[PDB]
Amino acid sequence: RIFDTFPLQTYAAQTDKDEAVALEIQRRSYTFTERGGGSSELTVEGTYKLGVYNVFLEANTGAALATDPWCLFVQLALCQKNGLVLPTHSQEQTPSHTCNHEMLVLSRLSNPDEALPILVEGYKKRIIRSTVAISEIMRSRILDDAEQLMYYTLLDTVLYDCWITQIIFCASDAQFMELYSCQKLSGSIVTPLDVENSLLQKLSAKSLKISLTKRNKFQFRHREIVKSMQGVYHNHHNSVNQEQVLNVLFENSKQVLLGLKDMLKSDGQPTYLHLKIASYILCITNVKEPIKLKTFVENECKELVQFAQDTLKNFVQ
């Protein structure tokens, strides 16, 4: 009726924004550039953001890569699909901006599932693709071949379990938190803020491990070594059965890696199997602590550490 004349006045939307936060999203964003020189034909409603656990700088090529095998696989697949080029440094190096796809470092707690990677598409009409949705999308592009699907399910069930068990159990918290945490680190306790971060890592390291054992039905396949983390007894009854399980996984995953050496020839564009072989190798050869998988792939698998480098030069310039 006449109650639709209110409000009497309306002003333009509040345009005040915080500059402390806009500086935060510049040290956590890495932009994918186009393949041919530099150009942009995108609108703010047609660009996506890839959520990752963290980012490390490659020693040889210098590109920025995600730390987790699944995040790195999706990052490589997106680059191949869209013709992009891998990043080199965060936007703090280039204050100016233009519409491009970018990769953003997020916490695990940025979605109900507590798992990454995720895709954030659009600006005004925004869609969130979760880890499960990304897995289903990525898997449904290889169903044409029945034999390439057999290998693909082997990598992310046997080798994935071998990687996850080792990172959580045979590696220290100081090494786990550099891969699956976005928290800052300095390496030297000098300022009083460097004492508040190490104690934060000590407190929160355990709860980050639990949210990682739920990403790929790990808590269902191994439901006895994920209940040993949810209590404080540290008895030898649960610590002898555990080493038996971890020894079977490593012995199985050596056969997988030895078998793959026979088929590492690509007659052109890499397939989704090659991009999944390469991501595991690149992520393994990043760990500083001498884990058994890294030792094995450095000593007996000197042909896989070259194949991964060969497939990575398709995306860096």
Binding site: L149, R223, E224, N235, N252, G259, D262
Partner: protein
């Protein structure tokens, strides 16, 4: 390989709840060549029926006389093939060993998922058949927790694939809603099953089709369990109409041939007290787990 293999079953027959206890006793019986019989020479079968011996809770488990434990059918047959000196069931060559491991792992991870549905989430089979077996397999106080735990675990793996008097009448309408849901779900199950086995049969053609591999014994055990339940005729018809009566008849003939085999290669043993699973040992193990 000296040790002992524990299983689900009784009277020398493996029960149908465990689809890999059935596939493991067909394995030993098919090791008749000189190199293959050395793989299992020295093994003994025990129908202990207590998961307290398993390293991760699953009863198909191998204990090698010195504390080494392996669990599941996939891990046992992979371990055994790595104890061949290299000097019925065939042994795969080196050039196509990864493919065979991939096939066997695929069956375990994707097709054995469906058989748990048919055993614990299908009401027509769980209500009248599955719950009865545990009364004969376990002991008097341990008759109720195990079926419930297995049923609860079976929906976690299959959730994302297969989803006065007037008050009495209204609640009876809920029953009709239940049959509506049950006829909704069967269309999802039959669509997933016809896609899993179609992938498996398309991948299997890359190897030799005239020999029996360790991966075929786990696929056939799944069909044997799945078509041997009271709700098995619908699946028998659905698979047949889409794959071929002659093909499925050949597979059923192979299943029958495996079932009717002499138990001469077997060498089984009466379980000892410490590996019985009775009330006293269950309490002892429960107390030791917290110490």
């Amino acid at each position: 390989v000296k040790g002992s293999v524990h299983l689900w079953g009784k009277d020398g027959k493996a029960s149908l709840i465990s689809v890999d206890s059935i596939a493991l006793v067909w394995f030993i019986k098919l090791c008749t060549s000189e190199e293959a019989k050395s793989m299992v020479a020295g093994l003994q079968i025990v129908f202990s029926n207590n998961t307290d011996l398993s390293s991760d809770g699953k009863l198909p488990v191998l204990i090698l006389d010195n504390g080494t434990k392996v669990s599941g059918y996939v891990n046992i047959v992979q371990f055994l093939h790595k104890n061949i000196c290299t000097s019925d069931l065939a042994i795969v060559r080196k050039k196509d060993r990864l493919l065979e491991y991939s096939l066997l792992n695929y069956v375990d991870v994707e097709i054995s998922r469906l058989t748990d549905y048919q055993l614990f989430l299908n009401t027509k089979n769980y209500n009248e058949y599955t719950k009865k077996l545990f009364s004969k397999l376990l002991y008097f106080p341990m008759w109720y927790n195990t079926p419930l735990q297995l049923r609860s675990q079976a929906r976690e793996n299959c959730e994302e694939i297969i989803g006065k008097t007037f008050k009495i009448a209204h609640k009876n309408k809920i029953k009709g809603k239940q049959e509506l849901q049950q006829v909704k779900y069967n269309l999802q199950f039959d669509n997933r099953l016809q896609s899993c086995v179609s992938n498996w049969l398309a991948a299997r053609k890359k190897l030799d089709d005239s020999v029996i591999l360790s991966s075929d014994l786990l696929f056939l055990a799944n069909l044997y369990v799945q078509l041997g339940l009271p709700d098995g005729n619908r699946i028998r018809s659905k698979l047949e109409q889409t794959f071929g009566s002659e093909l499925l008849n050949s597979m059923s003939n192979k299943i029958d041939d495996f079932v009717h085999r002499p138990s001469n290669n077997l060498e089984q043993r009466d379980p000892q007290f410490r590996e019985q699973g009775n009330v006293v040992m269950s309490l002892y193990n429960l107390a030791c787990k917290y110490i």
